[PDB]
Symmetry: D2
Subunit: 329 residues, 4 copies
């Protein structure tokens, strides 16, 4: 069985701890975090040791690591763990700077490391079923993709300043989803953006409401709509229109009931955020990773996928600034 070390014991870390513990072929061996209480919290809940990042790098009883530390640490930590011969799962992003990313990937290649990036949406049972429908020919040739993502609320200002901006922090999942759904590469990005929700996000130099169109060489188009706040919860919809039809995945909620009164028919709001919306996705993610470890199996999403997504995000940022379509090729 595959022995895991977890780095980062915050929201994202907890979600991965659960997934690892839930997986029958995986053992969660140690946790590390800057805040010791935060690693202890997970150590208790799951019965694993607390350790330093250094110690996990050094330990021969760690086959793989899961990196859920802050954004600034990622590229460094991947390189370190690839040097030490660990299989690596790293949460988005590899880095905010595309050149730093390329450097980090050279190391992975040179060390022959297994790296999976965290685009968890590719492992959602619902979104997977959309992709399998496309693969089975149910909608013919893909033509037009529509992706709408709305977070329940914006992060605080401090996270925004470090985050790399909405396109890189939020829209990046959707850029990856567009690549996942289209079946081929976007070669052009045009984007609009505004600050409609909270001035303070503008003051920090970010946007909170963005719209994007990507186009491939064959003309297929993907439209992305993003908003940092929705009162009804975590909006996560995909839709693909094709020559033979369309396929969509509806929004998920934790509980599905309906109450009818003179005021109408009411169903509950959506999941608060990724923690509960993507529980099954996290389990499928870890399982894929394990298959990619214990067998020599194709890793996806790869380091190449994290870069391509950032490339689109960078190209969107510029599109907004230069008020025009930005080539990628």
């Amino acid at each position: 069985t595959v022995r895991f070390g977890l780095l980062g014991a915050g929201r994202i870390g907890k979600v991965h701890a659960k997934a690892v513990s839930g997986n029958a072929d995986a053992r969660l061996v140690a946790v590390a975090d800057a805040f010791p209480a935060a690693a202890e919290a997970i150590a208790g809940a799951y019965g694993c040791e607390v350790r330093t990042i250094d110690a996990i790098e050094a330990a021969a009883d760690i086959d793989a690591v899961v990196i859920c530390t802050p954004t600034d640490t990622h590229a460094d930590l991947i390189e370190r763990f690839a040097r030490a011969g660990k299989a690596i799962f790293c949460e988005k992003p590899i880095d905010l700077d595309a050149e730093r990313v390329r450097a980090c990937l050279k190391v992975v290649s040179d060390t022959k490391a297994k790296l999976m990036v965290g685009f968890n949406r590719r492992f959602d049972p619902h979104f997977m079923a959309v992709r399998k429908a496309i693969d089975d020919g149910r909608i013919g040739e893909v033509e037009m993709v529509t992706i709408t993502s709305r977070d329940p609320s914006a992060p605080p200002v401090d996270y925004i300043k470090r985050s790399g901006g909405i396109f890189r922090d939020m829209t990046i999942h959707d850029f990856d989803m567009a690549r996942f759904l289209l079946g081929e590469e976007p070669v052009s990005v045009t984007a609009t953006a505004a600050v409609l929700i909270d001035k303070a996000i503008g003051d920090a130099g970010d946007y909170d409401s963005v719209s994007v169109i990507l186009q491939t060489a064959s003309g297929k188009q993907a439209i992305i709509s993003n908003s940092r706040r929705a009162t009804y919860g975590y909006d996560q919809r995909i839709e693909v229109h094709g020559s033979k039809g369309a396929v969509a995945a509806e929004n998920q909620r934790p509980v599905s009931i309906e109450i009818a009164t003179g005021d109408g028919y009411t169903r509950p709001p959506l999941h608060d955020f990724f923690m509960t919306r993507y529980t099954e996705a996290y389990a499928n993610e870890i399982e894929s990773f394990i298959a990619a470890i214990e067998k020599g199996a194709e890793i996806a999403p790869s380091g190449n996928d994290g870069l391509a997504a950032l490339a689109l995000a960078d190209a969107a940022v510029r599109s907004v600034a230069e008020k025009r379509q930005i080539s990628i090729a």
Copy 2:
């Protein structure tokens, strides 16, 4: 009693006739049409006269006209009937050339004439309830609009050649819808396009699958998605995300049943023909005209709504060709 002349005895003409005839405050006095069998059938159906356009224009027993003739006759007809002192309902568009439309409206302004343009979707009960919800404060401030429209099949190449292209012929309804749903004027347009469905359309100098982002001065965004072909029928969706919540209108189908087997739960496809989808909007549209004549209120959608829609289409054509964001004057 409002005395009507009808110019155009085709499919739409037949509908508007039905509406006018059955309205208690209006009478269909005469019909004019280049197809003499078509004008005769309507005359027989509603016991009114067949007249030439000239006779209807010069007649003293006609208070208003419904213009359902081909697009290239619209501007000229509007000017003539304004000068003759009739009130005018014209089917979209006024003309295809912005410059021509401007000159037409100068004539409507100077004659002080009543002109409604046929943007029927403003009169759809479902879309009207969406706008009403926004008016009632139910979603707070409008932030992001998404509009999806897909026809059940492409037009024939002869129709395409005199249509003025997808942005002017199809998307024009969505541009108006966007203005209807946004609080505000769009001041920028950006667009992508392709020929995904039938190369005969690309040859004829047109696109069949287009995407459009519009932004207002306050930064509000509307996204428009159009496809000329959808095997599942006539797809007409609007959604508006706001600060307090979101509102949307659902697709319509002629019967609401569901059959469940080992293959799944299946509901029928949507309407296979636009006129069946919009039977109520066409009725409300004329009813509203006839009512706005009598009390003599100011009219929407108006000539300028006709122009603004077209200019937005014009900017979309440029935006694709110039691969950049185009500003509205």
Copy 3:
């Protein structure tokens, strides 16, 4: 051209007058009612005559009659017009007393008259589609039928006293629906009942909340649920489970929008009034009556359908009182 007399100028009469007039194969010739002004308002609108019932019965220029007068006149009027050789459409029921109904139908049979009873739900587009799915074999052999009907508001006591009680007045439509969906005769009825909504209904000797199970000789079962009051509107559902799958018809509302907030996703309530739900069914029913006259066609729903549905109501009453399953002779 089928020439009609309308007997009864209340709200139902007005709707039926519309249907007859608008039909290319029918003319509304005369209208009777106990209140002169009611009859005059209809006749005047359709440019036809006010006549006495006696005159319509004697008249050689009347081919068919629509009966919309009070229930206690139906059996007598049907007999009269059957003897007079007119085709007959009668609003339910023939009479509240099954022996009286049997007498009426013997006269109908000896005179070889044509009689349709107004079980308008058989002509609803949605319920017809369900029945067509069954006829086409899409659910295999019918096994289990579930019918739910709930009114928006309970009727006033004076309505109740002349209604024959909930089973004869309300459930009667569901009993006919059951026969229509089962495609074979129920032979047993088991029912329960209560006064849950308004004690005044119980004080008048009636119930407001009832449950019924019908079973056929082959063992197929239909369950019926009825409530006199639902704050969410006029609930009318049918479901049929069969050997290969199941089929259901969904509730109808005036507009199809949805608002999402932190309180959840809310669709509007159902129609608040029954005639608004059944617009098309009333139109189809009359259309189909007129086509059956033009042809020499077999008229359904027939007098016998009227009797069969009442016999089920009578058995339900007795089942409630005697706490047992009642066999239908």
Copy 4:
């Protein structure tokens, strides 16, 4: 503290509880038993617990609680034995098919102050719980009329049918419990109909496969229940409650929710095959509630009396079909 569990029975239902016990943070699966050692071994293999005998689990100091997933004819005796041995007991439905036997069993459970929860897992489903909570919160006013539809993907085999006590005792039993859960009051009368519409071999075995039931309470509230042994579209599990101020319903669940639209229509996937995947959250919540009962001493629901009450409704349904009349509940 950690609750130490012995599992008795390693079939389908046993596997589902193994998973739920395993998945719970406060519990450890220590021992499995089964009459077929391969089946037990398989569960021991996959979870790293021991294969013991039932006698051993009974005598074991290192067992706090048992989950009884053995055949139905062993339930009442096993409950009495583990009650006397001081284990907390979770028992899959039924306690017994015979109400007098159930009564004798509950007397032993009461005399030994044993903790017994019976397996009406539907009460722990997040969707059904939220229906009940909405009713508790007053969102539909006073309950008036309940409608429950349950349809299995396909019928069990004849050998199972013959030892099952028949469709009312074996299938509808869950819906009788659900009706009591939703109504808030006891049914006092049962009237039912039945037939063999699906497979004549069920009828030849003395059972029915398609049944309809109406329950009524003293205040007049009514519950209609519809059951079919076979639905091509999967495991149909719906509840609906009409009240004075509105209605509340839980829709069916399916494993994947997508929609494909073509000229043929808009198609969503079929439902869950069976209880194994439909009720995974419910089985977690149930074990969680059982542990809470063990840890805090809270009174248990679904209790022994709830198992008895559902069986008494089933017995009344059987009589109602045979006698063609409404049967009152003692």
